RNA sequence: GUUUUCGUUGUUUUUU
């Protein structure tokens, strides 16, 4: 869950391209053409964003105590 | 590697399949990877061990 | 209609987990329990007579209660101050409550006196949490949502006081089926034909019989035979039973057991069982005979011992054949036909029967265990009414009826053999069997479910073996060859395998129906000379028909099997070679769903499957094309469900290739049968994908088919104590421990199987960088080298949770502890701990930095006498750091409040943390270097993880690097990489598409010294892997005392690093300590390290009997009146017991400070 | 080598427990039986498939 | 395993068919070993029979009680014991 | 081969009367005593090969689950058959397969 | 090699199947027939790997 | 001597008592019972 | 008839024909024995037992 | 107030 701040192998920001991605996803694009896009060169930084795997919605669909 | 079922050590063999590959010779490298019945063979050889 | 290809099985596959699942057999099962088994059991002896006879003029006041129908409630838990309210399974777990349901019963009555309706409450019973009257069960996922349930959690336990506890299914020998073993040489007995015959329905236990054959060759005398019947107290010869069991004379026992008359030899070899049963010619002797030896009481008589070894030659023998009256004939024959198997397999003329065969074994679920302790109960549950109803009947009261139901009957044993794990009554503790329910594992996903899919064999290892432990051909297929338990339970404790379903249970009259069909030849037809060569037909083990044209009646029961009408999982197995026929409607025989291949060869499918693109379209539809499931699948006869049994019957096809028979040198290809003698294969199946000959655990692993068995089983092992994310709502679970991964990260390498598991949704471990070489020398041994900044970007970073339960108690009924912050003056025997932390209710605030030494939950305790409270707080963990994370406050059952305070903490890795690959590849950290100091690529690249080159000779792990491979490609591509077993996948190919990504072929890459940034020689093989964090870390274990508390009785230190525990000094470090001239040394170790008191014993009885004072100075052995002669002896305080118990024993160990010479 | 057996059997005649005693004599294939405390008597059939049980089974059928 | 590591003497070590001679007369050979077959008659005339499998050979050899204790031993066995019957 | 009295169906003991001086087979239950078809009282041989085919079951030629060949048949002729071995487990049992077919069943060596 | 070198090595198994199986097999000192055949066979695959 | 037999913690404070002084109490009990078997009335096998 | 049977199964295996008893086969085994040379070295002999 | 106070049976699973 939630795609680390910094890219563990190199160290990139990457943290503000999730939506973007996800974006990219909607209009039935390609993975890795996208992933260019998102000027993820390194393939380190390329499967971290393509093999992440973000957990929160299922958490956040739970009904909160407050 | 014995005939564990009735004549045939795979359902995919036959009956007094005397040929290697019913009887547990590897016919595969590491590299290669192994057929599933003789891959069943390697684990009985592992699980001997 | 077209050929079979890969993508359609899977979808085949999608069918059967979108009808079935993986827990279908345990729902299917609990709810044949509470749909057949409950009632059945309720029912099996509905009628309950008194009588007073005598006067009321005379009479038969007949007070008479008749049984009737059963009641089920919907989960209610009924709270202790009359605030009913339906129970929810969250609120269960947070009070620690029980998922149970209460019951009720019609015990009518019925009052009778001759001159010559009713609902009580019978029990709460534990539910599965996922049966049909399970709380949530029509509710939608939105009211789960307002729940807050794990949708992923999918139930299939039971809920005990908040413990989720798991009924391990048991597997066990299947009876009624024919056992010769060859008995030891220095024996009388040669050959056991052993038959365990009893009831098929309940699958319980009735009796059994073992035959056994006198006598050696040219030694023995004759081949006598003569075995003890059940509850007799010698061994009776057959033909003398034969005798008493109606057919007196030999000719008919030869014609229940010589059917190749043809035969000589077996006829002078049954020449000296007539000879020694002679002395019988007639039923009466015969069955005085038996009644003698029959274990009757004395005074017995003539008739009534022929009328009681009438009786049991009738009940408890071939009791799963008939108890009652008329087939006493079906008895001969079928003893007859059993001494002829036992004679023939004497004779060596067939091979001795077989101990592992899965097809003569079953599997009890959940279903019929629970049943046999229901009837357990039960049968300790009707009769306190009639212990009841005899104290009151004497002074015939208005009894109310609803006092002498003890309805906590069946609470207590279940409870008991669910709690403690002892499957019996409390009072039986001795031959209780111990471990069919246990704690549901949830420190990961997988803990869980494997958990849920286990078989046991509780033989014991009374005899070790290598049988039980040992991989069988007839597994293959069946069960995961991968997962095994360590050493003590290695081999045993068995998983099933991917598609498997287990009979729940279907009648046997459908079945008996169907045979009878074909015309049938009784059993009293069934004779040496008019069926020479006919074929004996068998039901569930009981021999049931006789038949000479069986081909076509088997055509039609695999026929009707294939249409439904039979249940489609009913075993039908036809012995050709040996004139036989068998079918198996018991409940535990596991299926198979096999792709039907046209077996009548009348068609080009045969040779071909019956389910084309046609039924793959349907499936992937999700419905008819006018609803098609799997169960149309199953039921259109292009799918069917085999046993291990009916497998050995059949040549099945292992890939969608060699379904026809078919008619260049690759080095990167498996292979398939020769096929150069044996022209032709008519394969009758072909498995969906052998690829399904693994687990859940086994569907895993990337290409777990190059590597070796061993390390696929250590992968298979530690698989399921590899880190990761178990649960969505892990944080409203209260549990002992709980782990959370920062990052979970879908593997780069995935099987197809894997879909199913929905492993991009809940991944155990992170794709990260490792490069291969000997860089820092720290590799060596099972040791890693890190890259420091992944860590300190928190690459494997963790969450753990610990939840600390407390309670308070009742001494009395008002005497009760609080929870309060203790002080110096309310509170004595304090302890060093910070009190502090506790504010009003001795409860500690969420969010506060807790750590050892410190009370987070105050309690005081009553002092049994003004200043009479004690400390009964139980403080955080010493050595463990970290921030509440939740503190909930309920209430016991009954009146006491119940607390569940987590703690949360963050893990980081450190040098000697535990981590393993998915290819058994095992290893702790040896040493964490910066990103500076390690190489670089040409594009300044440095792998996260390093590990030891050694592991390639000696683990051999190719798979690992077709992963690798595999994982730079997916990449660099920027897609998931698929490592499926028994593929077509070709590493030659995931070269040459390396090199069109720019990358060397074969991985490597020149890496550039950290520290001087020079080209390393070799060009190093470098990029990422999914690995994977292990429960094991470093600090937990590091641990050192000098000195603690000690044991209460030894004196000498503790054992266990939870309470500061000593070292256990093993005898063999003794011995080499010897060896090694180590006196002072282990004496000391022994002497101040262990146990050593000084003590005054006498010189003249040489004993402890001294009185001694050292203030007093006085040593008076009351023993010898010693005083002056008693010397100081500073000995361990072990010697001191020994010494004490040597006297307790009336035994005089007499020390000596002399020599007696 | 004849054999003595000290039985437990109780008679019907001086009700006695540890009174009779059961002996088999194969030699001739002939039973026996007596009384310690009454000094009975009893004879019964022995075949090569007989056992002292047997003794005791058809005295009660004869005496009963 | 029961077995004695017999050392022939140097004449004999050099020697096989000797020694083979010295191997029979040490390996134990009862008719149990080498009987063929056993089918017991009561021949009914005490010098002679009424049976073709021995008519000629009790002719033969006969130039008390009936019954009679036959039995059948193996030519083959008897030659690779190196005996006769 | 033995066998049984009609009546009595007990074992037709064979013995000897003295006067006739012949072999009978006389079971001691009742007075049936019959002759000896021939004067051998019990055969009993120490190596056993018999029974390898009389025991044949017909709808062989109908078990699916068989290895094929190119082996030939002296009856049915089929350029595809089926190769079997003798019922013995005897240690000694030599490994000779007895080759069968569909139509012939017969106990038959290609040897 | 490696892939010839198997194949010759399923070739003398074939014909020791064939001798065994009509027993042309010659019996080995100690050496049972079809056990002759079955420890032959993994002289002869055990050369092969 | 009680140190052998030691009120062990069945609960933490509270002790179940020892199997040893369970035993002693009732070979003991058992004991006085054969005391008391001699001045009552014990019709032959209540004594044994 | 019983007599002769009994006599029968007992003769079939209390005649001793030849051979010492005890020794149910013996091995014609080869050994490689050192023995010294004329001129002063050693040599290996085969000796038959 | 120097000092200063926890334990066992049974059960399961485990660890090179
Ligand atoms: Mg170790
Ligand atoms: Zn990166
Ligand atoms: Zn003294
Ligand atoms: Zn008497
Ligand atoms: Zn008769």
Redesign the interface.
């Known amino acids: 869950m939630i795609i680390p701040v910094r890219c563990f192998s190199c160290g990139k920001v990457v943290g503000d391209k999730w939506d973007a991605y996800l974006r990219l996803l909607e209009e039935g694009k390609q993975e890795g053409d996208a992933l260019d896009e998102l000027k993820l060169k390194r393939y380190c930084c390329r499967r971290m964003v393509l093999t992440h795997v973000d957990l929160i919605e299922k958490f956040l669909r739970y009904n909160p105590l407050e | 590697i014995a005939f564990g079922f009735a004549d045939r050590s795979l359902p995919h063999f036959t009956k007094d399949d005397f040929s290697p590959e019913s009887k547990g010779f590897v016919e595969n490298s590491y590299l290669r990877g192994l057929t599933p019945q003789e891959f069943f063979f390697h684990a009985m050889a592992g699980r001997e061990g | 209609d077209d050929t079979i290809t890969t993508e359609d099985c899977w979808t085949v596959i999608s069918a059967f987990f979108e009808e079935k699942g993986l827990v279908s057999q345990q729902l299917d099962s609990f709810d044949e329990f509470m749909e057949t088994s409950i009632q059945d059991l309720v029912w099996e002896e509905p009628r309950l007579i008194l009588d007073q006879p005598a006067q009321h003029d005379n009479i038969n006041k007949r007070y008479e209660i008749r049984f009737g129908k059963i009641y089920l409630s919907r989960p209610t838990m009924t709270e202790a101050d009359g605030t009913t309210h339906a129970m929810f399974p969250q609120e269960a777990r947070l009070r620690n409550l029980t998922y149970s349901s209460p019951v009720y019963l019609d015990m009518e009555k019925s009052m009778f006196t001759s001159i010559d309706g009713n609902k009580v409450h019978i029990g709460k019973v534990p539910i599965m949490l996922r049966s049909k009257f399970c709380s949530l069960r029509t509710l939608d996922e939105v009211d789960l949502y307002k729940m807050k349930e794990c949708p992923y959690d999918m139930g299939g336990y039971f809920v005990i006081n908040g413990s989720e506890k798991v009924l391990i299914a048991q597997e066990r020998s299947a009876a009624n089926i024919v056992q010769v073993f060859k008995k030891a040489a220095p024996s009388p007995i040669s050959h056991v034909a052993e038959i365990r015959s009893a009831l098929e329905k309940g699958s319980r236990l009735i009796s059994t019989m073992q035959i056994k054959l006198y006598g050696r060759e040219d030694k023995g005398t004759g081949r006598t035979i003569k075995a003890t019947l059940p509850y007799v107290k010698q061994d009776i010869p057959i033909v003398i039973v034969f005798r008493a069991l109606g057919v007196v004379p030999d000719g008919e026992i030869l014609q229940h057991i010589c059917y190749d008359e043809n035969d000589w030899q077996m006829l002078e070899m049954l020449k000296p069982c007539i000879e020694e049963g002679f002395v019988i010619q007639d039923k009466e002797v015969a069955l005085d005979f038996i009644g003698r030896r029959g274990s009757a009481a004395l005074g017995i008589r003539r008739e009534k011992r022929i009328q009681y070894a009438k009786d049991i030659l009738q009940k408890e023998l071939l009791p799963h054949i008939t108890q009652e009256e008329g087939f006493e004939t079906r008895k001969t024959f079928f003893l007859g036909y059993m001494v002829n198997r036992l004679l023939l397999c004497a004779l060596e003329r067939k091979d001795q029967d077989d101990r592992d065969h899965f097809g003569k074994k079953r599997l009890d679920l959940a279903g019929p265990l629970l049943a046999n302790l229901f009837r357990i109960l039960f049968r300790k549950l009707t009769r306190e009414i009639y212990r009841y109803m005899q104290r009151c009947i004497e002074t015939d009261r208005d009894f109310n009826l609803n006092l002498a139901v003890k309805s906590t009957t069946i609470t207590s044993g279940l409870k008991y053999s669910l709690a403690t794990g002892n499957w019996g009554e409390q009072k039986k503790a001795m031959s209780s069997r111990a471990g069919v329910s246990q704690v549901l594992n949830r420190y990961t996903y997988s803990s869980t479910l494997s958990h849920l899919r286990r078989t046991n064999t509780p033989i014991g290892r009374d005899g070790k073996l290598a049988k039980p432990r040992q991989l069988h051909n007839t597994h293959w297929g069946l069960v995961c060859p991968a997962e095994t338990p360590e050493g003590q339970a290695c081999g045993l404790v068995k998983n099933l395998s991917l598609l498997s379903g287990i009979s729940i249970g279907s009648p046997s009259e459908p079945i008996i129906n169907f045979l009878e069909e074909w015309g049938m030849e009784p059993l009293e037809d069934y004779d040496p000379a008019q069926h020479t060569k006919s074929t004996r037909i068998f039901v569930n083990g009981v021999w049931t028909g006789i038949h000479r044209d069986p081909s076509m009646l088997v055509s039609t029961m695999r026929d009707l099997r294939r249409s439904g009408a039979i249940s489609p999982e009913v075993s039908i197995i036809r012995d050709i070679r040996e004139r036989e026929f068998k079918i198996f409607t018991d409940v535990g025989r596991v299926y198979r769903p096999l792709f039907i291949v046209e077996d009548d060869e009348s068609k080009d499918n045969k040779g071909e499957l019956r389910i084309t693109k046609e039924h793959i379209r349907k499936i992937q539809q999700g419905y008819d094309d006018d609803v098609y499931g799997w169960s149309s699948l199953v039921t259109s006869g292009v799918i069917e469900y085999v046993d291990g049994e009916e497998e050995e019957t059949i040549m099945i096809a292992m890939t969608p290739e060699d379904l026809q028979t078919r008619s260049l040198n690759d080095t990167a290809k498996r292979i398939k049968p020769e096929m150069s003698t044996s022209s032709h294969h008519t394969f009758t199946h072909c498995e969906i994908h052998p690829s399904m000959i693994l687990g859940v655990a086994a569907s895993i692993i990337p290409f777990p088919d190059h590597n070796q068995s061993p390390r696929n089983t250590y992968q298979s092992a530690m698989g399921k104590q590899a880190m990761g994310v178990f649960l969505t709502n892990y944080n409203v679970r209260m549990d002992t421990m709980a782990n959370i991964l920062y990052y979970p990260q879908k593997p780069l390498a995935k099987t197809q199987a894997m879909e199913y598991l929905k492993f991009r949704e809940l991944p155990a471990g992170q794709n990260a960088i490792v490069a291969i070489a000997c860089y820092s020398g720290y590799n060596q041994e099972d040791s890693m080298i890190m890259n420091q900044s992944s860590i300190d970007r928190g690459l494997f970073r963790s969450l753990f949770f610990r939840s600390y339960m407390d309670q308070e108690k009742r001494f009395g009924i008002s005497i009760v502890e609080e929870f309060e912050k203790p002080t110096r003056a309310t509170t004595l025997r304090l302890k060093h701990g910070t009190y502090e932390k506790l504010d009003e209710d001795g409860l500690i605030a969420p969010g506060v930095r807790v750590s050892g030494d410190d009370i987070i939950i105050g309690k005081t305790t009553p002092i049994p006498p003004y200043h009479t409270k004690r400390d009964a707080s139980t403080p955080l963990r010493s050595t463990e750091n970290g921030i509440v994370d939740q503190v909930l406050l309920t209430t016991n059952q009954e009146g006491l409040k119940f607390v569940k305070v987590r703690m949360r903490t963050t893990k980081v890795p450190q040098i000697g943390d535990k981590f393993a690959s998915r290819h058994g590849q095992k290893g702790t950290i040896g040493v964490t270097y910066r990103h500076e100091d390690m190489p670089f690529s040409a594009e300044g690249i440095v792998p996260d993880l390093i590990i030891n080159p050694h592991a390639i000779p000696s683990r051999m792990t190719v798979a690992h690097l077709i992963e690798c491979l595999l994982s730079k490609v997916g990449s660099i591509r920027g897609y998931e990489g698929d490592a499926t077993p028994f593929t077509d996948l070709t590493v030659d190919a995931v070269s040459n598409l390396l090199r069109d990504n720019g990358y060397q072929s074969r991985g490597f890459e020149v890496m550039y010294n950290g520290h001087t940034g020079k080209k390393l020689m070799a060009q190093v093989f470098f990029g990422p892997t999914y690995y994977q964090r292990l429960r094991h870390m470093v600090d937990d274990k590091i641990h050192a005392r000098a000195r603690g508390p000690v044991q209460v009785l030894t004196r000498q230190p503790v054992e266990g690093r939870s309470r500061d525990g000593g070292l256990r000094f093993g005898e063999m470090e003794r011995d080499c300590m010897i060896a090694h001239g180590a006196a002072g040394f282990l004496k000391e170790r022994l002497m101040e390290a262990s146990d050593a008191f000084r003590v005054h014993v006498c010189g003249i009885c040489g004993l402890m009997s001294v009185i001694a004072n050292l203030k007093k100075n006085q040593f008076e052995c009351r023993s010898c009146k010693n005083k002056t002669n008693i010397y100081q002896l500073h000995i361990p305080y072990a010697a001191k017991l020994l010494f004490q118990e040597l006297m307790a024993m009336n035994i005089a160990p007499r020390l000596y400070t002399e020599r007696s010479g | 080598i004849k054999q003595k057996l000290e039985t437990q059997f109780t008679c019907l005649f001086c009700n006695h427990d540890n009174s009779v005693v059961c002996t088999l004599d194969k030699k001739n294939s002939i039973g026996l039986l007596e009384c310690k405390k009454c000094n009975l008597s009893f004879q019964a059939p022995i075949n090569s498939l007989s056992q002292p049980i047997d003794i005791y089974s058809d005295w009660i059928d004869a005496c009963e | 395993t029961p077995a004695l590591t017999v050392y022939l003497d140097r004449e004999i070590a050099l020697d096989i068919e000797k020694a083979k001679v010295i191997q029979s007369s040490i390996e134990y050979t009862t008719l149990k070993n080498v009987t063929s077959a056993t089918e017991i008659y009561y021949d009914p005339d005490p010098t002679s029979t009424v049976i073709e499998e021995d008519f000629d050979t009790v002719e033969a050899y006969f130039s008390q009680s009936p019954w009679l204790l036959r039995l059948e031993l193996d030519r083959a066995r008897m030659l690779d014991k190196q005996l006769t019957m | 081969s033995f066998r049984f009295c009609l009546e009595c169906n007990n074992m037709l003991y064979p013995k000897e009367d003295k006067e006739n001086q012949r072999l009978l087979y006389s079971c001691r239950n009742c007075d049936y005593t019959e002759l000896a078809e021939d004067p051998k009282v019990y055969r009993h041989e120490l190596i056993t090969n018999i029974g390898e085919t009389a025991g044949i079951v017909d709808d062989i030629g109908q078990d699916p689950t068989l290895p094929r060949s190119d082996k030939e048949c002296p009856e049915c002729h089929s350029r595809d058959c089926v190769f079997f071995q003798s019922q013995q487990r005897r240690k000694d049992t030599n490994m000779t397969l007895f080759y069968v077919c569909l139509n012939c069943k017969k106990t038959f060596r290609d040897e | 090699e490696?892939?010839h070198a198997?194949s010759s090595a399923?070739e003398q198994?074939?014909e020791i199947?064939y001798k065994?199986?009509?027993?042309e097999?010659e019996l080995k000192?100690?050496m049972?027939?079809?056990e002759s055949?079955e420890g032959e066979?993994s002289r002869t695959?055990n050369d092969?790997? | 001597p009680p140190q052998v037999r030691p009120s062990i913690a069945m609960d933490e404070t509270t002790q179940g008592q020892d199997d040893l002084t369970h035993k002693l109490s009732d070979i003991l009990k058992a004991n006085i019972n054969v005391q008391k078997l001699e001045m009552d009335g014990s019709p032959q096998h209540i004594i044994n | 008839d019983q007599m002769l049977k009994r006599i029968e199964a007992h003769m079939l295996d209390l005649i001793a024909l030849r051979g010492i008893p005890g020794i149910s086969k013996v091995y014609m085994v080869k050994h490689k024995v050192s023995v010294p040379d004329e001129s002063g070295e050693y040599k290996n002999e085969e000796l038959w037992a």
């Open positions: 490696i892939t198997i399923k198994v074939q199947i065994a199986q009509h027993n097999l000192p100690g049972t027939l079809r055949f066979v695959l092969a790997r």
